[PDB]
Design a protein around this ligand. Structure first.
Ligand code: GTP
Ligand code: ACP
Ligand code: 7Q7
Ligand code: GDP
Ligand code: CA
Ligand code: MG
Ligand code: MG
Lengths: 437, 54, 426, 334
């Protein structure tokens, strides 16, 4: 057994962590107080779920998690919230004042005074691990803390834990739920500095989640809570194979091997079906063929882009619920003849399938209805470079006039770091261009 | 068409299906980068306090 | 926590109205005791009030003047007893509408006493985020001493946000001929030392009172009714909880693309005369259309002569948050030439459930438009009219000033104007 | 008020569409790099499709179908027709074509050339026209740009009096729903000099382009014979009609070509929307059999038809998505 530490940076990371650990607790049958009555080895063990939870002599199952925010307000709701007992205070780290939507204030100014504290609290979890394999980092591209402090953490984790893997759950910025005008700057800056330090990154465009919540859940104006509970389903599907008995994606190293041949191009597209409203009056249950087919509609993707115009390098199907291999192979055979699925010549046109029979769990009183079967496809497609092109253009428009740059320079950062970061992104868009033509 | 490396258990089962074949910086340098930005902040705060002194 | 400062006649009179309005919104009476009916009123009351003996709330407010007159009126006025008595800091001989007296002679005597009260209030603060000043730019105390205070506050608190509500002078509401001088000297200071300045133009406040509100001869009280409703509006996001998680520093970051261009046009809808309550509530399309109309702007600038760099809008009341998004996006897409295309997503809208006293629906507008250059050009023209003949200059040279300081102020304000013009065509 | 942008100034067609839209008074034109548009009359090269359909509260539509270049480029068109099961090499309406690169299916090209050498029946090809295979290959190998080698139609239909070669151009509008609208007016771009059977190198009698013909206007006005003209000639000279002898085959080829690529280019469930005007170029032989020469992504319309066609584009491609306050198209049914 090999342990995994989850790190949650900024508001987005923290509030998405909440949604995830709440869901993990429901899936494994762990309570608000941390007691898991189904566990029989009291105060220890090396089961699949022990990858995400350590144990105390008292029988409590405590998340291998560190929540870090430069402002107390958000993490205080964790400290007083329904899962207050689940974490111990040293896991929940809060600063005094935030990075104010500024990468440079998060990375350089306020980052420096708190980085040693966090790495120390990370070391206090790593010393409880008999075989740490690495880290899952949750954050926003848009926030100052999420962009700035995260990239500093990822720099230092490569120094301290060089042999261990680092996965990212990144929230890509959208005007529909934006907190700042400079989020394109922060997104490019952090992607540049984090790129070589991150082994695999699952981007979630808030635009994509927002419209899924409008279109499929019938919610006029989605809150963060709506977006996060949907995000945590996608996260849970991706992490399920680390937390449950299986033979696909069993360690973090396998995510690199399966999904990431080119190391810079390490941004797999997640697609998820089906998303169904909890107070839909009459619902017809969707089959293996229908939900597998839904994995190739752009309207169900975590990032809106077009996989038809682009090439695949790898494709995972992660099923949860009533699914058998026979149905999956028959679904794939039908879809192959009707849709435009093109792999790169140097890769096999094929799918790694993983079924878990336990159907997806939903939060009681939530917006998501129970389903007999669901699926999360993880495809490394070049079509996700569309998200980079969008974001880089917005950067160019502002940076051409040096708009807002003085805020960054005023925290110690050099103007050079902007165009240095932008050149890397221009190279990244070229890396995608070559692979998919 | 060809299903390979099928594995099963009580929780689930996994396999592969192939349709067609093919054809870091140090702790020193990080501390140097952070502190060079702290010196540029201090220089800028000095220029402000020098201007206010005038 | 914000530390409020109010300097001079105008500063103290709009400042007293502000505390009057927001205390009613938070349910705080003239004795400082909370008698409200919602926990939402008290959730961010730390931002403007200090908690005292017997769970009484006292405004974090410093009252400054070189005249005793106006501060005696504040103390004897309706909410005067809520202010902490030690925070009344005042000289005796006034500034006689003279910037030099405020900035260099009479105000120098008194400034350290004010900074002692500022420091006392700052040490009580858990996490001081910044300062806000109310003042005019056309007199002597609020203009001259107010900008001295700002400069000395930036020395002691260099990394904190400085915020001003700066009332601009106009011949239509004119105390003295030297106002363009006092204003230009003050603008020079605000350009260097403030992060955000709400340009409250007395011309605009008059025109709104005369044309739109149908008051043939408006008083300062009528003008200040518009100022207080605007001030409540822009401070809503600091004073009440929302989804945005609003902050003085984050506002500055998102509103100010270039450090010198931090002069905002405030606007308000619906416009209301004092006392008399309008009965018909506005639709969301009416709020949206009114707040962007030039008639509702508190700075006398036609926004169609410039372009919006950034916009912040704050809707108050029980309404469809979808309908607000739709209408806000409608205004942008139907008038896209008047927003800069090189700052994506430059209009942000927040909503607060609690509406202000009187109204059930309202909207407050905060625009960093390049059309604000018209305001500065106007004061620059009035400045030059007198200064080319060195007229009235003896009042200032007699207090130690040189003509060079006037020439430098004229010159930096004309730079500000041409810098606004730079981005109007970019 | 709907909003649009124009990013292709050379577009003869969409210059007239932008002019017509402004005149209705319910559309205003924005600046080139304004992202806040409803419509996009986009560029020909590197059209940034990844930026479309990401503007809150804005339904976005563009006048190009991403991936339609597969049909509108010569090398790709040949590769589409050979590889696709819907069309196949069985495909009777496309000339026997091969893809050749400068120093690839040269081994397959020479196999059919030496099977033409079995019976030694007529063996002419086109890239610029020549009979010998080694004469053609040496032209391609020292040029740099890749262009295919195609079976040349030795026995084309010949208009009289004149003994003239010609090609038919049909305009096709595919809307956001993937309705395929064929415009009722086409045009015959004619030769004005007799077709030479013996010698191939003679320029104007073999190639029948809009511009290369500038004899220019002998038999009709500006080398353009319209559909009423050409129908009557067929009725008098051949006893048949344009509809029966030629136009069914056109309708079959258009439909077969756009059905093939629909799954790749359709914008049915997408976040942005596409329409496009296509130019299909046909060649009729002496036995009244229609052949597809090329598909054109940015088609140049003929002078008489602009007013009518560009109004039709507005009617069913633009106003169908963006409604305001008899039809000129024949819908091809699928
Ligand atoms: N999906 C999702 N996105 C969020 C959430 N909270 C914030 N965001 C997004 O994250 C971006 C802003 O970053 P935050 O994480 O709020 O900021 P932060 O990291 O706390 O940084 P500072 O407050 O600037 O120090 C915006 O694009 C928001 O839409 C959340 O709970 N869920
Ligand atoms: N296989 C073939 N048989 C007979 N004629 C052919 C032919 N291939 C090309 N041509 C002739 O060459 C001319 C121009 O060729 P083509 O249409 O390939 O280029 P063009 O692309 O430059 C014209 P357009 O773009 O307007 O369709 C046509 O008018 C046609 O008559
Ligand atoms: C200080 O109070 C406010 C903070 C904010 C505010 N707080 C945090 C982040 C913000 N970002 C913006 C903002 C302002 C202008 C354009 C923008 N585009 C994207 C964000 C944004 N306003 C913010 C907005 C306000 O108006 C609605 C406020 O009332 C004046
Ligand atoms: N809006 C408003 N403007 C005022 C008020 N009192 C004075 N002014 C303006 O402020 C300028 C005079 O400044 P004042 O504050 O009286 O002088 P100070 O006390 O020496 O700063 C003139 O341009 C007046 O029009 C007021 O109560 N409201
Ligand atoms: Ca155990
Ligand atoms: Mg934050
Ligand atoms: Mg006065």
């Amino acid at each position: 057994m090999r342990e995994c530490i989850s790190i949650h940076v900024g508001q987005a990371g923290v509030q998405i962590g909440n949604a995830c650990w709440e869901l993990y607790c429901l899936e494994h049958g762990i309570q608000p107080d941390g007691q898991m009555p189904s566990d029989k080895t009291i105060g220890g063990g090396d089961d699949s779920f022990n990858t995400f939870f350590s144990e105390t002599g008292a029988g409590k199952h405590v998340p291998r998690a560190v929540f870090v925010d430069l402002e107390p307000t958000v993490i205080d709701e964790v400290r007083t919230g329904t899962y207050r007992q689940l974490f111990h205070p040293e896991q929940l780290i809060t600063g005094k004042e935030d990075a104010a939507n500024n990468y440079a204030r998060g990375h350089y100014t306020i980052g420096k005074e708190i980085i040693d504290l966090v790495l120390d609290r990370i070391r206090k979890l790593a010393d409880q691990c008999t075989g740490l394999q690495g880290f899952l980092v949750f954050h926003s591209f848009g926030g100052g803390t999420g962009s700035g402090f995260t990239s500093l953490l990822m720099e230092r984790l490569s120094v301290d834990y060089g042999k261990k893997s680092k996965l990212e759950f990144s929230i890509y910025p959208a005007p529909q739920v934006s907190t700042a005008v400079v989020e394109p700057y922060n997104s490019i800056l952090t992607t540049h500095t984090t790129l070589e330090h991150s082994d695999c990154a699952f981007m979630v465009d808030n635009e994509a989640i927002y419209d899924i919540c409008r279109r499929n859940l019938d919610i006029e104006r989605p809150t963060y809570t709506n977006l996060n509970r949907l995000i945590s389903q996608i996260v849970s599907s991706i992490t399920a194979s680390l937390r449950f008995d299986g033979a696909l994606n069993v360690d973090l190293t396998e995510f690199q091997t399966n999904l990431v041949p080119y190391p810079r191009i390490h941004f797999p597209l997640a697609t998820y079906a089906p998303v169904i409203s909890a107070e839909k009056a009459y619902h017809e249950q969707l089959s293996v063929a229908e939900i597998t087919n839904a994995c190739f509609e752009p309207a169900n993707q975590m990032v809106k882009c077009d996989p038809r115009h682009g090439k695949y390098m790898a494709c995972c199907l992660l099923y949860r619920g009533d699914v058998v291999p026979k149905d999956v192979n028959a679904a794939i055979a039908t879809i192959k003849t009707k849709r435009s699925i093109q792999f790169v010549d140097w890769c096999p046109t094929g799918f790694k399938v993983g079924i878990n029979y336990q159907p997806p769990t939903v939060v009681p009183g939530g917006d998501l209805a129970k389903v007999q079967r669901a699926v999360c496809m993880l495809s490394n497609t070049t079509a996700i470079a569309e998200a980079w092109a969008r974001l880089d253009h917005k950067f160019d428009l502002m940076y051409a006039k040096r708009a807002f740059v003085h805020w960054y320079v005023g925290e110690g950062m050099e103007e050079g770091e902007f165009s240095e970061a932008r050149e890397d992104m221009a190279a990244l868009e070229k890396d995608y261009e070559e692979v998919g033509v | 068409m060809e299903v390979i490396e099928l594995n099963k258990c009580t929780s689930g089962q996994s396999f592969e299906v192939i349709l067609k074949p093919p054809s870091d910086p140090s702790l020193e340098e990080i501390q140097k980068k952070l502190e060079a930005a702290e010196e540029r902040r201090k220089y800028q705060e000095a220029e402000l306090l020098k201007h206010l002194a005038e | 926590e914000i530390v409020h400062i109010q300097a001079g006649q105008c500063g103290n009179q709009i400042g007293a109205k502000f505390w009057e309005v927001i205390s009613d919104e938070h349910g705080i009476d003239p004795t400082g005791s909370y008698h409200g009916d919602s926990d939402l009123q008290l959730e961010r009351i730390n931002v403007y009030y200090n908690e005292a003996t017997g769970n009484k709330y006292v405004p974090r407010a410093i009252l400054v003047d070189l005249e005793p007159g106006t501060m005696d009126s504040v103390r004897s006025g309706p909410f005067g007893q809520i202010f902490r008595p030690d925070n009344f800091v005042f000289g005796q001989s006034g500034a006689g509408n003279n910037w030099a007296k405020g900035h260099y002679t009479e105000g120098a005597e008194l400034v350290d006493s004010v900074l002692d009260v500022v420091r006392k209030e700052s040490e009580s603060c858990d996490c001081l985020q910044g300062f806000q000043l109310t003042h005019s730019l056309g007199g002597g105390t609020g203009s001259g001493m107010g900008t001295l205070l700002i400069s000395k506050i930036r020395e002691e608190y260099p990394d904190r946000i400085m915020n001003t509500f700066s009332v601009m002078p106009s011949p239509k509401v004119s105390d003295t001929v030297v106002e363009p001088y006092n204003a230009t000297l003050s603008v020079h200071q605000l350009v260097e030392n403030t992060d955000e300045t709400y340009c409250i133009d007395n011309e605009a406040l008059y025109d709104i009172c005369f044309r739109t509100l149908k008051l043939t001869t408006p008083t300062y009280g009528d003008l200040n009714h518009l100022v207080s409703a605007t001030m409540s509006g822009v401070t809503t996001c600091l004073r009440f909880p929302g989804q945005l998680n609003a902050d003085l520093r984050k506002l500055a970051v998102n509103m100010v693309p270039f450090p010198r261009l931090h002069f905002f046009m405030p606007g308000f809808a619906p416009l209301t005369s004092r006392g008399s309550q309008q009965y018909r509530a506005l639709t969301v399309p009416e709020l949206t259309q009114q707040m962007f109309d030039s008639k509702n702007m508190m700075a006398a600038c036609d926004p169609r002569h410039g372009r919006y760099l950034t916009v912040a809008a704050i809707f108050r009341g029980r309404m469809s948050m979808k309908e607000v998004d739709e209408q806000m996006l409608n205004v942008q897409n139907k008038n896209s030439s008047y927003f800069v295309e090189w700052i994506p997503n430059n209009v942000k809208t927040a909503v607060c459930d609690i509406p202000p006293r009187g109204l059930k629906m309202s909207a407050t507008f905060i625009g960093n438009s390049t059309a604000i250059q018209e305001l500065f050009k106007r004061i620059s023209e009035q400045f030059t009219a007198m200064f080319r003949r060195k007229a009235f200059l003896h009042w200032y040279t007699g207090e130690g000033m040189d003509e060079m300081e006037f020439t430098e102020a004229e010159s930096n304000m004309n730079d500000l104007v041409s810098e606004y013009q730079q981005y109007q065509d970019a | 008020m709907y909003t649009f942008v124009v990013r292709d100034e050379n577009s003869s067609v969409y210059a007239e569409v932008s002019r017509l839209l402004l005149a209705t008074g319910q559309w205003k034109r924005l600046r080139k790099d304004n992202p806040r548009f409803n419509l996009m009359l986009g560029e020909r090269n590197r059209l940034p499709f990844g930026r479309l359909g990401h503007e809150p509260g804005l339904v976005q539509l563009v006048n190009y179908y991403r991936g339609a270049d597969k049909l509108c480029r010569k090398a790709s068109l040949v590769k589409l027709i050979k590889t696709s099961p819907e069309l196949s090499e069985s495909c009777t309406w496309f000339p026997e074509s091969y893809v050749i690169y400068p120093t690839d299916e040269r081994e397959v090209f020479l196999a059919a050339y030496n099977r033409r050498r079995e019976g030694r029946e007529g063996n002419v090809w086109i890239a610029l026209i020549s009979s010998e295979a080694s004469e053609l290959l040496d032209f391609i190998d020292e040029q740099g740009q890749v262009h295919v080698i195609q079976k040349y139609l030795e026995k084309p239909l010949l208009l009289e009096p004149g003994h003239r070669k010609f090609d038919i151009r049909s305009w096709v509008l595919v809307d956001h729903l993937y309705n395929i609208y064929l415009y009722r007016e086409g045009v015959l771009r004619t030769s004005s000099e007799p077709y030479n059977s013996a010698n191939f190198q003679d320029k104007t009698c073999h190639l029948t382009n809009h511009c290369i013909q500038k004899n220019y206007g002998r038999y009709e006005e500006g080398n353009e014979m319209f559909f009423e003209e050409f129908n009557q000639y067929l009725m008098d000279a051949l006893n048949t009609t344009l509809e029966n002898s030629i136009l069914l085959q056109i309708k079959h080829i258009i439909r077969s070509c756009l059905m093939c690529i629909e799954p790749a280019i359709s914008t049915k469930h997408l976040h942005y929307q596409s329409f496009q005007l296509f130019g299909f170029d046909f060649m009729v032989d002496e036995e009244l059999k229609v052949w597809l020469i090329e598909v054109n992504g940015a088609p140049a319309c003929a002078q008489k038809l602009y007013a009518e066609l560009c109004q039709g584009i507005v009617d069913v491609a633009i106003s169908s998505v963006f409604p305001l306050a008899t039809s000129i198209f024949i819908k091809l049914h699928h």
